[PDB]
Amino acid sequence: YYKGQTALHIAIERRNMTLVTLLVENGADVQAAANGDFFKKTKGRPGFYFGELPLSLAA
Amino acid sequence: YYKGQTALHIAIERRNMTLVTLLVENGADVQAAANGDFFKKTKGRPGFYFGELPLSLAACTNQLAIVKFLLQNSWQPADISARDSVGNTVLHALVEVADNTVDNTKFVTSMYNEILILGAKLHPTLKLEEITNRKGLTPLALAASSGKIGVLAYILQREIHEPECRHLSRKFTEWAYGPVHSSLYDLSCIDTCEKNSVLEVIAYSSSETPNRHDMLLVEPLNRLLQDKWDRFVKRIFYFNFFVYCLYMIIFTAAAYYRPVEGLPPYKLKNTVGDYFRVTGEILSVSGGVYFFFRGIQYFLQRRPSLKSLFVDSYSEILFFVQSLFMLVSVVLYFSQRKEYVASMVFSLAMGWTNMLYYTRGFQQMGIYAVMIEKMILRDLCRFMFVYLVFLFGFSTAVVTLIEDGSYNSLYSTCLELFKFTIGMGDLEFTENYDFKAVFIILLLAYVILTYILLLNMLIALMGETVNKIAQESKNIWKLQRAITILDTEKSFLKCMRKAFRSGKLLQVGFTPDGKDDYRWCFRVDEVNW
């Protein structure tokens, strides 16, 4: 599952700066609880090993 | 003769586009029967091995303009699926002309992709890539069997990212999560094409294919072999190894405790040991018969020639030879002879030695055993001639130098000079014999030539050979594992289909017709930026 994968995560993930600026100005939260079983660690199964924070995506 | 060498053929051959255009517009036919003896295969003699069709010439000459021009003729349209005398089409021609070089690979790959997509657009209902020649080979199977590694590497993982064209792709990238990409490969006719899959033709080649070792290193095949290894083949192989070990132990126990009377057979008594002994003998002979029939089944299903039989498939030959020795032993056992012991011991020694066959499946042990096999075959045929020349020459010299009315035989002297190799030479094994100085000179010359110079040269040359087979050993081990996997899945002893990869997964969902498509896609995860 992809819990907490809000639009801000997708805009950052796709490297689409326009969406990032629009969502941020519209009030998208930064402290997102992106704790989806896919989006967390455990790289052995399919997953995303540097999630759980959109600033982690930004960096 | 140059039968069928029409003007269009010559215009294309000379790369004169003006003449080609004029002749085509004038109504020159495409289906030329360029079947002259010059235009046949066997390029060793003067000839032209990829003729018998002007489309084959147009594609093989790397001229896109001609092939794109013949798509819509003014008078007589061209047909890509036209077949020569041996069933080959343009795609088979493009496969055959390859020579496994970077530039040639680029040209052939480009022309193959362009001609295939153009044929698909012109005739979406026709699957050109699946058409077989007279030998029952698709261009993929032909490239794999003949040794065209470059074209094989292209075809197995080609992709087109365009609408109404991706359905022709082999590779896909359907899902991605940031840096993660989940590639798919359809891999039809690799696990099975109902006659000849890619793995079958690569692994069971006649040993003349130059790249049979390198083809299995490509991206999808190596992962498939590893997957089948990990899935079920690993367990069956280790089980077979364990069973064989038990068989050899039983055979050894039966041999060691054989009776010591004369003129077999020997009858059972009211004791208990005889029942264990005869049980071991029966199990041993049963194993021998099993390996006998395995050897025959291997031969019949392959029918290799002498130039392929004794340069390949050594393990099957050795197991069969073990079976022959055991059966000869059985015959002598019932024939009231003592000589059954000789064949039995040869069988026993060969069985224990053939225990090394199972080091395949273990990485380091398998590489080690392959190096040993190659450095036996390459080294004995070079070394033993030189050594035996020296040994026999000095043996005859010494034995004819000494004689009396004990070492008067060439056998004993050959032995005494052999001992100098294993560090037990005497330098004085006769006394009071004539020409003592000559005798000593001969022995010292033998020792210097053989013990001090020749064996050290053997060590040094083995060092060089070892340095030059670090990679060939890895490739050969991978090939041996491939043979093991293919044989295990082919037989499997249960008549069950466990070779499937992932099921009928909806890879594409599109064809030129308004239908979906399931293509047995195999997934591979990679990470990159």
Ligand SMILES: CCCCCCCCCCCCC(=O)O[C@@H](COC(=O)CCC)COP(=O)(O)O[C@H]1[C@H](O)[C@@H](O)[C@@H](O)[C@@H](O)[C@@H]1O
């Ligand atoms: C009286 C007592 C006599 C004892 C005699 C003992 C002999 C030595 C015993 C050697 C033990 C190892 C073994 O028996 O196995 C070795 C064979 O070693 C020899 O060559 C023995 C020469 C003789 C591997 O056998 P394999 O059939 O796998 O060969 C491979 C093919 O499969 C594959 O297709 C490829 O072509 C690959 O390049 C091939 O290598």
